[PDB]
Amino acid sequence: QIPATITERYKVGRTIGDFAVVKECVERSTAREYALKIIKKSKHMIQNEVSILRRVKHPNIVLLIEEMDVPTELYLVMELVKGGDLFDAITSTNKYTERDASGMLYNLASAIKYLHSLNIVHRDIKPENLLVYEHQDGSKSLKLGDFGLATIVDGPLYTVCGTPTYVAPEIIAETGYGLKVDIWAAGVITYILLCGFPPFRGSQEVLFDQILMGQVDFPSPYWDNVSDSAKELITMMLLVDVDQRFSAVQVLEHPWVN
Ligand SMILES: COc1cc(N2CCN(C)CC2)ccc1Nc1ncc2c(n1)N(C)c1ccccc1C(=O)N2C
């Protein structure tokens, strides 16, 4: 049901992601591959995400190319990351080396640092919203996407959202939260990369009470070969104290990411 302007210039392919749907497409003039995200409309949440996607341009954030708006849906031509999401990559590989995990955290922290410099909190940083990028070198980067929950922090936020595995304890406590919930989610992800399981796993109230306690353990034998530098960084990212918890700048300054 797609407008002529899109089909005129793009050959729409298979669905690659399923509120919205994402499809593969080929730009006819160049044969270069892109992504088409189709957001269905109701008879304010879409306006917010496009306003964010218009402002965010960063090599580690999925780029918005152009918008085609019709009454029933909104069409977004977006960058295609051909690696797939990080969730599928973690399912196939089990765990990563410290060198691979540290380079991936460098990409995530770069995107978060850029977002926080705009006072944008993502609020949905998780492996399903990270995309693995294939370089010419064979090296792989990460790109952050899906800003449907992103918002500008002009004061403390209180709305509970995000996937519980990655949700910061201040969100669960409903006492107010800001940009640093993104750092906590990045800390949980880094922890998953280094060992293959989340730091807080629960049994749904068990998981929340464990996050609120925020006791990060590095169990044997899974963490025996992991460096103390990595355990220090993850610990500083997963601090319950919002003031002591690392900012994205502090994450990037840490030796393990350098
Ligand atoms: C070949 O590329 C992919 C393959 C798979 N599948 C998964 C299923 N498996 C059976 C085969 C491999 C998946 C994805 C991508 N790519 C991708 N490139 C760009 C996205 C995006 N997904 N979608 C889906 C997004 C997903 C999360 C966050 C943002 C986006 C976002 O806004 N954009 C614009």
Numbering used by the authors: 381 to 398, 401 to 425, 431 to 590, 594 to 648
Task: Give the published text.
Doublecortin-like kinase 1 (DCLK1) is an understudied bi-functional kinase with a proven role in tumour growth and development. Multiple isoforms of DCLK1 exist, generated by alternative splicing. Here, we report the crystal structures of DCLK1 kinase domain in complex with DCLK1-IN-1 and its precursors.
In DCLK1-KD:XMD8-85, the sulfate coordination is no longer maintained. In this conformation, the DFG phenylalanine packs into an hydrophobic grove and contribute to the intact regulatory and catalytic spines, indicative of an active conformation. This active conformation is further confirmed by the presence of the canonical salt-bridge interaction between the conserved αC helix glutamate (Glu436) and the invariant β3 strand lysine (Lys419). The interaction of XMD8-85 with DCLK1-KD results in two hydrogen bonds interactions within the ATP binding site. The secondary amine (N2) in the linker between rings D and C of XMD8-85 acts as a hydrogen bond donor for the backbone carbonyl oxygen of Val468, and the  pyrimidine nitrogen atom (N5) in ring C of XMD8-85 acts as an acceptor for the backbone amide -NH of Val468. Notably, the amide carbonyl oxygen of the diazepine ring B participates in a network of water-mediated hydrogen bond interaction with the invariant Lys419 and αC Glu436 that play a critical role in nucleotide binding. The N-methyl amide substituent at position R4 on the diazepine ring B confers affinity for DCLK1. This R4 N-methyl group  appears to form favourable vdw interactions with the gatekeeper residue Met465 (on β5) located deep in the ATP binding site, as well as Ala417, Val449, and Glu466. Firstly, the ortho methoxy substituent in ring D in XMD8-85 is likely better accommodated in DCLK1 than the bulkier ortho ethoxy substituent of XMD8-92 as this bulkier substituent would be expected to cause unfavourable contacts with E406 of DCLK1; secondly, protonation of the N-methylpiperazine of XMD8-85 at physiological pH would enable an additional favourable electrostatic interaction with Asp475 of DCLK1, which is not possible for the 4-hydroxypiperidine substituent of XMD8-9228.
